[PDB]
Amino acid sequence: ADQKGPVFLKEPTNRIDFSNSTGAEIECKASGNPMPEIIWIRSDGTAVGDVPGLRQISSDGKLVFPPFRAEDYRQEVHAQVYACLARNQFGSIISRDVHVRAVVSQFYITEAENEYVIKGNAAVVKCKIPSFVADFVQVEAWVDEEGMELWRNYDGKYLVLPSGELHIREVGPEDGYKSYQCRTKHRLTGETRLSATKGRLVITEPVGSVSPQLSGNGNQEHITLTRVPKMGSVTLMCPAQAYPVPFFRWYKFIEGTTRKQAVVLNDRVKQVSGTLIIKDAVVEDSGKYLCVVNNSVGGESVETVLTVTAPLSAKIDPPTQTVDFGRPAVFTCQYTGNPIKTVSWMKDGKAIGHSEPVLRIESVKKEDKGMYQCFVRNDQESAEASAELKLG
Amino acid sequence: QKGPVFLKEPTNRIDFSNSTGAEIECKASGNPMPEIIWIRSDGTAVGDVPGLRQISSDGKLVFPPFRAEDYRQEVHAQVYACLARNQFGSIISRDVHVRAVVSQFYITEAENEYVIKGNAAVVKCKIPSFVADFVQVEAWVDEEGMELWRNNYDGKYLVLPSGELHIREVGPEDGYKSYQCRTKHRLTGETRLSATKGRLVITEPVGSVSPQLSGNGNQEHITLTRVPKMGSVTLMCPAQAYPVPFFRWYKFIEGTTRKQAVVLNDRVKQVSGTLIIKDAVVEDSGKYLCVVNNSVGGESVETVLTVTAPLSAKIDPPTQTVDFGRPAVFTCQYTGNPIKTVSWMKDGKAIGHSEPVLRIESVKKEDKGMYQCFVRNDQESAEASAELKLG
Ligand SMILES: *[C@@H]1O[C@H](CO)[C@@H](O[C@@H]2O[C@H](CO)[C@@H](O[C@@H]3O[C@H](CO)[C@@H](O)[C@H](O[C@H]4O[C@H](CO)[C@@H](O)[C@H](O)[C@@H]4O)[C@@H]3O)[C@H](O)[C@H]2NC(C)=O)[C@H](O)[C@H]1NC(C)=O
Ligand SMILES: *[C@@H]1O[C@H](CO)[C@@H](O[C@@H]2O[C@H](CO)[C@@H](O[C@@H]3O[C@H](CO)[C@@H](O)[C@H](O[C@H]4O[C@H](CO)[C@@H](O)[C@H](O)[C@@H]4O)[C@@H]3O)[C@H](O)[C@H]2NC(C)=O)[C@H](O)[C@H]1NC(C)=O
Ligand SMILES: *[C@@H]1O[C@H](CO)[C@@H](O)[C@H](O)[C@H]1NC(C)=O
């Protein structure tokens, strides 16, 4: 009973990101009797061809992108979606999505911007990262004028949020005598850069007659919807300037309920000034939060949406089944992870059926004996599980 | 012969510097003429506060100028109202929001913004949140003593009604110039220039860059802006990508998951990826969206818009005489946008009805008096007065 359809031993990761000097190689391995042949394709289901010095298919089936020149860059190659297909006589199955992105060595700079504060009011200096280079660039550490710096590596005064921003506990004219620059790390080449300018604190002495933020003439409230992976640290921003120091109360909405509740403050969950930090996010943390700002004059609130993503996975049951002619045949897709955008089924590398979690065949015919796959797509990643339908 | 009716009401907002005085007028009418009484937000009568507020002979509250140390919140920041009454009953004027402003130390900034060659840039003037209400952007100033004010769209350099500066089809030639924002304080007229000169740092495109989005994290923002009716709006879709993307603005509608293409015209203008609306109306309050796209990928920046129109209420009939035992009826017409809630009053106290039409099954002796329709929204209020006579 060694005869069986193909199954993926190793699927490449959903994200392959590399540089032009680095080059890259993608491995795809499958089993089953006879050993299936490995083949690379695109979204439309056509086999990818070789390209000189750019895209190679090695003897043992693999996708090789050699290191190339910035001029040799071709989008339809270097920014593309690929999929691995394994097949033998019994049937064929397609891998999950593989997003290949070859970054090049670019020029970018960051700058720390100055922020206005008031005595007694905390604040945050940020690091401007160009939006285009911001995906592969995050701040390694902040710095102080004489150069002794602060990593995640003591008196809580300066807190570094997981967002890579410097927090300052309360404030005082003593604080504005310092300047800071943020250093950043490229997660591809590992190259580092100091920010173009040292950020500074301008501290305003108040008198009276001021309420937090809002607007009287115009403008808006910013609803910031943000997502953080499971097991990752979140951040929720409630920066404001008021008179005198106000109260910050974090709240949360439950699943469409307009009734706002209290946020439990744990050793894992800290309200800091008005800024909330969560460690090790999970699906339950997903929801919209609220920050109530009131001093004696009243106020207005920061609305924030949180969505915790978890890595996608798929399992089909039964993994293999043999049913006679005329009977029903049923497949059940069992998946985990968030968010789940679309669900779909495939047959020998062909789209079939609806988006339903359960694929059913009323009367199984002889032509139905190929491989069946279940695909769960997401805004970011995807995944799938194979299966085999034999006959009797 | 008749009850109180307002001749001249006070306004919704009075904003004034401490260095400037201020006053609010309430004229009333009636037969006999009603007495005028000013009241706090809680309905309590206000007295003379020396040097801060005094009640003038003419039936108007006068706030004289004051030193910042004499500021008192229970006076200088509050909602007042004007109650006028006579034998037959009482009425109350629309809420009057009174905010006195002290001149506060501040400074502005023009910050650099990073872009890709061929993409469009928008430079912002940083205005601290606290004075941001009274401080707005007059013009932008370059290093040449040139300048940019607003206008009545196809040019490279253009100033947005939001007080920002849009630049189209950028190239290295653009980063060769700095910029400073000219601001104006509307209560005083103080003028400044941003202490820092904003420049443009440009990056030569090398290889494919999808629209902004995020792969790791934060930065997807829904801005919900409100602009007065007849005013000019600004709808933003910041993006930086290579090759240069294109921007399609769309419009959601009530209770819909879907949208439709914004129809461009002489009234509705698209500058690069930025959408501008002027001479707008209530119908122009949708929930908008812009979709950025290029040969790589795409992104959507979502924006909610609210156009506000001045609230004005009415009642018909303004007066009716009813023989005891029959029904009274009061219909209330209102306008202005939006409408948050509605309330009713009797001789200066809330009866607690939330609906436009007010009926009374059995009219009695005590039921005779003055009835008022009260409509409001977040920033504004409006009232309508009605009298009831007993036959
Ligand atoms: C992957 O792509 C990157 C980006 O294009 C590429 O790095 C580049 O390599 C080229 C060489 O092929 C560099 O070109 C220059 O060539 C002149 C001579 O023609 C040299 O003088 C240059 O040295 C400069 O170095 C300093 C900057 O670091 C300058 O300030 C100095 O004055 C010299 O001008 C340089 O060698 C090009 O500068 C780099 N650019 C970057 C951003 O790295 C890399 O080689 C590619 N990988 C491959 C092909 O495997
Ligand atoms: C409304 O309130 C505003 C602000 O509260 C107020 O404007 C202020 O006017 C006063 C003067 O009337 C200004 O006070 C000056 O401020 C400096 C500090 O910046 C002080 O050091 C000055 O004192 C000098 O003068 C002395 C001699 O008189 C010297 O011997 C001494 O060494 C100092 O040099 C001076 O008091 C203040 O700066 C402004 N503030 C603003 C924001 O404009 C305004 O007058 C009020 N309106 C009224 C009262 O109608
Ligand atoms: C807080 O401010 C909100 C306005 O944003 C207001 O509705 C609420 O009553 C205030 N609560 C307290 C306790 O100040």
Ligand SMILES: *[C@@H]1O[C@H](CO)[C@@H](O)[C@H](O)[C@H]1NC(C)=O
């Ligand atoms: C535009 O981008 C959206 C996602 O932001 C995508 O769904 C759509 O297909 C794109 N359209 C074009 C023409 O690129």
